[PDB]
Amino acid sequence: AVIAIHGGAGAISRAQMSLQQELRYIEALSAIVETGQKMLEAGESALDVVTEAVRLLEECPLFNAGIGAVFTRDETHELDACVMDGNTLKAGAVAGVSHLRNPVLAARLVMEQSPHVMMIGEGAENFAFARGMERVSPEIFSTSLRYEQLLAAR
Amino acid sequence: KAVIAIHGGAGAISRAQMSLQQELRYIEALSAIVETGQKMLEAGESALDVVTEAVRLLEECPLFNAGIGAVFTRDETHELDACVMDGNTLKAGAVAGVSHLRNPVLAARLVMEQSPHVMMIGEGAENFAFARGMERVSPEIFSTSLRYEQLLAAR
Amino acid sequence: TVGAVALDLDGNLAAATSTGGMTNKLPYQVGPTPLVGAGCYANNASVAVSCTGTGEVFIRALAAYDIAALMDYGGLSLAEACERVVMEKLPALGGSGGLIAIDHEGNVALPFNTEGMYRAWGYAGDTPTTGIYRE
Amino acid sequence: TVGAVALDLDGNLAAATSTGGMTNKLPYQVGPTPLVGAGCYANNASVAVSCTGTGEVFIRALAAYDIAALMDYGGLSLAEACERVVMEKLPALGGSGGLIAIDHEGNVALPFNTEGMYRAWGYAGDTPTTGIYR
Ligand SMILES: [Cl-]
Ligand SMILES: [Cl-]
Ligand code: NA
Ligand code: NA
């Protein structure tokens, strides 16, 4: 029984980073993987474990998902998530959502409470809201650092 | 060895429900579109242009649930989806949830050919297509009395 | 749902699929049609595929890419791959429908597990075949 | 993009992926994350996969499902499959990124072709490994 997590691949620069900066990411990754290991050891399901790990990575503002999502061309946030259960081969996915704090929880709702597999935008939001998931403003996802990366990319 | 295949959908096509005249309307549409594709292939047109035109014809054909003759949603609207893939470059283009584009497969090919993207959705896909000079339509043009009668039958 | 697959005189494969989805669908539901490897896939190295059927099962089963992978990696013939996917794996997930496929050798397949599939195919310079019901 | 894969004590596999996409993306452009077999795939018979990378290439290459098919049909090990996909096929299409994968046997892979991938893994009741760079 085993977990792996990621917080995204790309041009992460060593000559750009202090050890203290790096350790912020290392600490966040170890705390989330430890939560998952402890859940697995206690006999939680692979599905609950990957759901909670991705929820924590969403909450973690260091990673581009949920809180700390990158900015679009229009200085908005549009989020996507997916989950798949290897036991049932069921899957749920939301694409282009801006008013759901934890897209992975919405993705799991689609998997568990629908046959649809993939829902998009307002439809995905209305699906989740009709099942009591709370509506948020996309402003909660905003961080200074991702805003600086938007200004950098232009 | 050049060759084309087409489909117009799989389902509970009922023999006891259909007249020969009804069946021949489907046979005629399938043979005309497959023959256009064979003639294009034989003249040396690309697989990509061949499947693009065949799917455009199936869209225009109101017998088939794509483009004109699209089924109705719960809200008595039409939302259309399409994909095209080039086996040579492994490029693909796709549009999901579009209501104001006459030929979704041409919008899919626009994404493939005139963007670095694979898939666009909804108004974004439409705004992308309009900005590339694709004409806007009303989703009313997709409506057929037969698909409407099937919606009323389902509820 | 409608679709086309073709192999041209240059040995290129291509596939296309278009749909209005299921009658009475929720707005903003996305079936297999616009999803690479679900409703549509083409690769000069293997197969061009266009699917039509129970939408979700075609996504979960990635039916269009599974034909290709069964052939490319598994060494299945187009016929064996189409049988495996349409007649065994899709029903196993409660999926009904079919697909059309052409491989890089110009073999053609139009499998379906339903009562009918509106379909047609033809070699360039040959007469077309059409069908509705099971052959 | 963020992701998790896991094998539980019942031998079940699951995968999850979540993202805000590319900085400066067009709204209503769709990366691999919500596309089954592109950004996310799990099957008890093979592998659980969560991807992160140049989005279009992961879709065109169906990266997450390709790991599973290369293993299931091709007989490749998880390691061979991850090498083939991330180090050969993705670069061949000009795709950059990586993925995390666990197979039904509890083998784990975290391949990437980029300068870094924020990653961690651990066996239940063992100490976790973390990484950023190559
Ligand atoms: Cl017949
Ligand atoms: Cl490191
Ligand atoms: Na986050
Ligand atoms: Na039509």
Numbering used by the authors:
A (entry chain AAA): 4 to 157
B (entry chain CCC): 3 to 157
C (entry chain DDD): 179 to 313
D (entry chain BBB): 179 to 312
The article reads:
l-Asparaginases hydrolyze l-asparagine to l-aspartic acid and ammonia. The prototypic class 2 enzyme is EcAIII from E. coli. EcAIII belongs to the Ntn-hydrolases, which are expressed as immature polypeptides that dimerize and then autocatalytically cleave themselves into α (∼20 kDa) and β (∼15 kDa) subunits to form the mature (αβ)2 heterotetramer (a dimer of two αβ heterodimers). The same Thr179 acts as the nucleophile in the autoproteolytic maturation and in l-asparagine hydrolysis.
Variant RDM1-8 has two relatively large substitutions at positions 206 (Tyr) and 207 (Gln). In contrast, in the second dimer subunit (D) Glu234 is directed towards the center of the active site and is hydrogen-bonded to the Nɛ2 atom of Gln207.
